[PDB]
Amino acid sequence: QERHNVLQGSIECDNEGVLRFYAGNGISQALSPSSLNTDFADNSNWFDDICDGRVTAVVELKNG
Amino acid sequence: CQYKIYPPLGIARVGNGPAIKPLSLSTPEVPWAHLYDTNVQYLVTQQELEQLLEEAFGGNVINEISQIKTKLKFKQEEIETITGLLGLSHLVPQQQLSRSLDNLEDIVQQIKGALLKVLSDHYLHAVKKQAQNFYIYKCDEQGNPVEKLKLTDGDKVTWRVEVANKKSFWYDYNNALDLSLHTQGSGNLSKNVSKHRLAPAMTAKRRNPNVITNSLRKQLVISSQGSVSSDNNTQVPLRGKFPANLQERHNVLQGSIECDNEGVLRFYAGNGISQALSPSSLNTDFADNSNWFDDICDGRVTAVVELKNGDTFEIQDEQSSAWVATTPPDYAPQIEPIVTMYDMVSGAALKEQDLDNLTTQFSDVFPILYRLYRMQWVNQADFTDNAVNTQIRELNSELGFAQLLDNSASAKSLREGIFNQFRNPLFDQDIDVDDPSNEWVSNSRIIPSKDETNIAAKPATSSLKLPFYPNDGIDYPGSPVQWFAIPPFMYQHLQNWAAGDFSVTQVEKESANTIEELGLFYSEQFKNSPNSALLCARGALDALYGGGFHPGVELTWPMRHNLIYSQNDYVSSVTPEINLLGLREFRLKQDLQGLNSPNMYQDFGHVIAVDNVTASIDPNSDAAWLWRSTPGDLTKWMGIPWQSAAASCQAVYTPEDFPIPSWWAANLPVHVLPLARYNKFKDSQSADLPEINGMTHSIAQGMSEETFEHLRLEQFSQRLDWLHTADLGFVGYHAEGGYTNGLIQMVSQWKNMAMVMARPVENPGSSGIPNVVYVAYSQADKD
Amino acid sequence: SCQAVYTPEDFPIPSWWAANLPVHVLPLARYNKFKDSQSADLPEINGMTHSIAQGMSEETFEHLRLEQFSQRLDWLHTADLGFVGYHAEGGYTNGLIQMVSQWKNMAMVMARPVENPGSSGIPNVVYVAYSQADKD
Amino acid sequence: NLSKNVSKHRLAPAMTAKRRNPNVITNSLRKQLVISSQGSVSSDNNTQVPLRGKFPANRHNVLQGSIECDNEGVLRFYAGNGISQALSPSSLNTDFADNSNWFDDICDGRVTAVVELKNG
Amino acid sequence: LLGLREFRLKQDLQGLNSPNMYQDFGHVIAVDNVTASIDPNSDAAWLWRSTPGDLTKWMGIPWQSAAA
Ligand SMILES: [Mg+2]
Ligand SMILES: [Mg+2]
């Protein structure tokens, strides 16, 4: 099974504690080049780099 | 003349098997050497991979391992050590061997099975590469190759190969331009075709027409080169780029070369990878798809011999150097095309008006009958709808094939009855002349265009002649050139045979009671013929197609003209008494500057037309470069990518169901006998197996012997469309199938198509099944 | 659309409703190449000349009969359903479209006799598909 | 109308062209592909006369036009109704120029007259 | 205002009954046929001597697809 790397996003935090979340590069692809995405919504053999999920954090103060 | 390379035109076929000797094939060096060899393995087998894996072991490997079992899941330099020891990274990427042992936990068997699985995933059932061996022969007899070069201590040979692909740079293939070329006629093409306008040559536009100016169109040409010497057997890749040089670029492996210590060059074609520059560019045309590249190539092979005493011999002139072309796989290597590319070389040297001087032996006519008979394994019409093949079975059944070798009057009607069924390449029979402006219209069965007209067809008044294959003139309904004829010089042999104007030896007669007995006899004549250099020259081309050319399979119509050869001479019969169509010394015309020729990127502007071919005939002309090949010139005409041309090289259905016309079935089969059926007729009723011919032992042995043998022949008779031996777009609920999905899917599925291999039937009993059958292996068709 | 549904595995080929819309049939052209016995006194016997049919061994003659009997043709190929001609597309959808006019030209299966099957293994009653395309 | 440069410098080479409706073979059978009609009208009668052919010729009636003459001798020529059709509904005209199995009611042809004065 | 001209087509005076009503050049037409047509004595000169149907036969069939 050939696998494809999918960049779903990138995250970074500055020194003030602000999280910045970047989406992917807009890369969508099928597992075979001959699989064309001819339907508006439902194309088998395709993936894209859209995603969604859970954002949590832990705050740690100097006093422990 | 000192040394020469053989063959003069070598052939290597693409395949996804590895470029290593144990798992590859070699282009035939002796014609007919293996026609009944039931041990052939044209796909990589489990046993071959297991053997490769065993040899990769120890080496100290086993106790280099054993030392680490004690010392403990592994670490990376931990197994970085125990790869590299194996010597497998030239077969599978080193990455994937790493994580294959990552997933692990007798440890020298957890190791093997994990490695065998990687090798099997990559190579099990893969289409083996057919590599060409090239040899240096020493000369005098003045120009005759006496013996292969034998290197002594201090002697060295260096080989040089320069190849290119110009398919994406060249013109659309619409039809063969030589169909309108004014000629006196050759051994390969009657003057009637051009003289009576039977199949006019069309104009053709450029492929990839949006790339303008010659300078930018150079990017459409893929090229590479390399050298190897008898002083190092490391294999060298021939790797180019497409587009060539923010341009996204693809590496293209055009082939690989290696030379052994004895000075033999072995040339491997590419992996069969074709691709477009954008995934959405589909290859929907049989021949002309813009934005596509493939890894086919062709080019110039030269060498230098350096002897111990300082002497140096350059093998670079066109009389002594060679050419190599790569091609689609041969999916039935033991099934020969009825007219081969070697036959085109032979016919190119003959003038049509001189064919009255041709001398004929029975061994000149036998190949036609034998090859047509063997088409039954790849084409339904030649199994069940070919009256000549059925008459041969009739003769074989009473041990009476030798009557065909009788040149006397009492056998004349027998010979004539067979000859009269063959299409005459004058293309002047079975026609009615409009305007005796005069158009020759066939009154036999035509092949309609897909562009239908709901007007009643004109009823055919003449029987369809043999063979039942389309031809160069397929575009023109009612042209006699819609259908294939054996070329003028081979038809002349058959005509002489029918007339009784042929010779044959008594020794041949004594081995001629069946067609197979005589074929075996003639195979022995090739095998013991002492001219190994010329046999190798012929063997390279006798498995390639010689018609029809639309564009063909491996090569196309420029090969049937003497203008493409710098030398083309008859040398001898295969045997002092037995012609077998003869042995010849031929050489391609070559541009000696190769990739550096100023004509490497020539064309004729917005279109190519037969007028350009007409202008090229004069060797002093501006256009003569067309015949003086630079790398890429032999294959540039062919379909781009080759896979959609292969998917288009199948059946062409007529309104009448039978016979089904087939293009090139000897090399791209059309109807095959699948492994699933072989497994249902190979066994005798007494076989010591719990399952016999797909039945329980008890059921197989309970039925009558007569019914048992009938079931065998029924299974033997089930022929499967070759296009259905892999998923070419017809698999699944409401799958569309159809012609165009075949073209598109063949780019990935070519490597999964059925491969035809001789197999034994140990005890056919009275079933009628021959002792050697030709069976098509694919994953879809295996049960 | 009521025909074969192909799987990745070649065999067996699944068929929807083959008793009423056949999927693989025995054409008239094949019937005419196995219905005769070798003793027939016709100028053509089972599609062979009298000379050839009677010259071959009786075992080979019966083998040829059974080979012909065994040749089954896709029922969708018994009329022009869009696959006929040079570069014809064929395929599923052309079949749907062309059946509107071609349903009346599809092969019709009818019981027919084999008077003397001999040792060939062919039954005395066979079911033969008649169409204009598959008659020859 | 056309510079010699176009041919001289091969700026746009003429292409070969195959026959439309190529499955109809022999000149005699291809005459069926031609639709033709004729008619006459006179100063004596302004009754309109249809120019009506058949396709294939010797099946569909093709009104190629209509002619009238008024009492002053003026000929009025009307064209057809703009009807184009294929011999089978399933034959779609997917090409800009070259669709087999299709006919239309376009035509062109020869216009002649005879003047008959009272003095003979 | 670009002038006024007297012009007339070449005509085959037999019209629908002309022996050249159903002429063609075989399996293809090509510029070679037009080249030969230039010579008024050629067997291709009929190209320029119109019989009914000769002006519109070149155009797209049917005209509606060509218009779209
Ligand atoms: Mg072959
Ligand atoms: Mg029923």
Side-chain angles (χ1 to χ4, degrees), chain C residues 17-22:
Chain C
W17 300 299
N20 287 8
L21 295 169

PDB file of all heavy atoms in Angstrom, chain C residues 17-22, ligand 2:
ATOM      1  N   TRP C  17     -30.414 -12.210 -14.768  1.00  0.00           N
ATOM      2  CA  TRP C  17     -31.693 -12.790 -15.082  1.00  0.00           C
ATOM      3  C   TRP C  17     -31.608 -13.616 -16.395  1.00  0.00           C
ATOM      4  O   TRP C  17     -32.480 -13.485 -17.303  1.00  0.00           O
ATOM      5  CB  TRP C  17     -32.764 -11.723 -15.232  1.00  0.00           C
ATOM      6  CG  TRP C  17     -32.982 -10.896 -14.034  1.00  0.00           C
ATOM      7  CD1 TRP C  17     -33.395 -11.392 -12.774  1.00  0.00           C
ATOM      8  CD2 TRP C  17     -32.849  -9.475 -13.866  1.00  0.00           C
ATOM      9  NE1 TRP C  17     -33.528 -10.361 -11.872  1.00  0.00           N
ATOM     10  CE2 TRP C  17     -33.191  -9.190 -12.511  1.00  0.00           C
ATOM     11  CE3 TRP C  17     -32.482  -8.379 -14.704  1.00  0.00           C
ATOM     12  CZ2 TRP C  17     -33.193  -7.880 -11.912  1.00  0.00           C
ATOM     13  CZ3 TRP C  17     -32.450  -7.111 -14.244  1.00  0.00           C
ATOM     14  CH2 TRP C  17     -32.803  -6.777 -12.858  1.00  0.00           C
ATOM     15  N   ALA C  18     -30.596 -14.464 -16.463  1.00  0.00           N
ATOM     16  CA  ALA C  18     -30.177 -15.033 -17.738  1.00  0.00           C
ATOM     17  C   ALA C  18     -31.208 -15.949 -18.397  1.00  0.00           C
ATOM     18  O   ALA C  18     -31.127 -16.198 -19.598  1.00  0.00           O
ATOM     19  CB  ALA C  18     -28.850 -15.783 -17.552  1.00  0.00           C
ATOM     20  N   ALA C  19     -32.185 -16.454 -17.635  1.00  0.00           N
ATOM     21  CA  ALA C  19     -33.179 -17.328 -18.245  1.00  0.00           C
ATOM     22  C   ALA C  19     -34.078 -16.569 -19.203  1.00  0.00           C
ATOM     23  O   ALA C  19     -34.602 -17.161 -20.150  1.00  0.00           O
ATOM     24  CB  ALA C  19     -34.025 -18.036 -17.176  1.00  0.00           C
ATOM     25  N   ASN C  20     -34.251 -15.262 -18.999  1.00  0.00           N
ATOM     26  CA  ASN C  20     -35.148 -14.494 -19.847  1.00  0.00           C
ATOM     27  C   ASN C  20     -34.441 -13.425 -20.657  1.00  0.00           C
ATOM     28  O   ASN C  20     -34.927 -13.067 -21.733  1.00  0.00           O
ATOM     29  CB  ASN C  20     -36.252 -13.843 -19.001  1.00  0.00           C
ATOM     30  CG  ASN C  20     -37.260 -14.865 -18.513  1.00  0.00           C
ATOM     31  OD1 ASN C  20     -37.057 -16.066 -18.672  1.00  0.00           O
ATOM     32  ND2 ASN C  20     -38.359 -14.396 -17.934  1.00  0.00           N
ATOM     33  N   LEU C  21     -33.312 -12.923 -20.161  1.00  0.00           N
ATOM     34  CA  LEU C  21     -32.403 -12.042 -20.891  1.00  0.00           C
ATOM     35  C   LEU C  21     -31.046 -12.733 -20.850  1.00  0.00           C
ATOM     36  O   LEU C  21     -30.230 -12.485 -19.945  1.00  0.00           O
ATOM     37  CB  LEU C  21     -32.372 -10.639 -20.280  1.00  0.00           C
ATOM     38  CG  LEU C  21     -33.709  -9.896 -20.391  1.00  0.00           C
ATOM     39  CD1 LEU C  21     -33.700  -8.630 -19.539  1.00  0.00           C
ATOM     40  CD2 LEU C  21     -34.026  -9.556 -21.833  1.00  0.00           C
ATOM     41  N   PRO C  22     -30.781 -13.647 -21.789  1.00  0.00           N
ATOM     42  CA  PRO C  22     -29.569 -14.472 -21.718  1.00  0.00           C
ATOM     43  C   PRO C  22     -28.307 -13.630 -21.668  1.00  0.00           C
ATOM     44  O   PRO C  22     -28.278 -12.471 -22.094  1.00  0.00           O
ATOM     45  CB  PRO C  22     -29.624 -15.303 -23.003  1.00  0.00           C
ATOM     46  CG  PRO C  22     -31.055 -15.314 -23.405  1.00  0.00           C
ATOM     47  CD  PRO C  22     -31.637 -14.001 -22.933  1.00  0.00           C
TER      48      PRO C  22
HETATM   49 MG    MG F   2     -36.838 -17.890 -20.276  1.00  0.00          MG
END
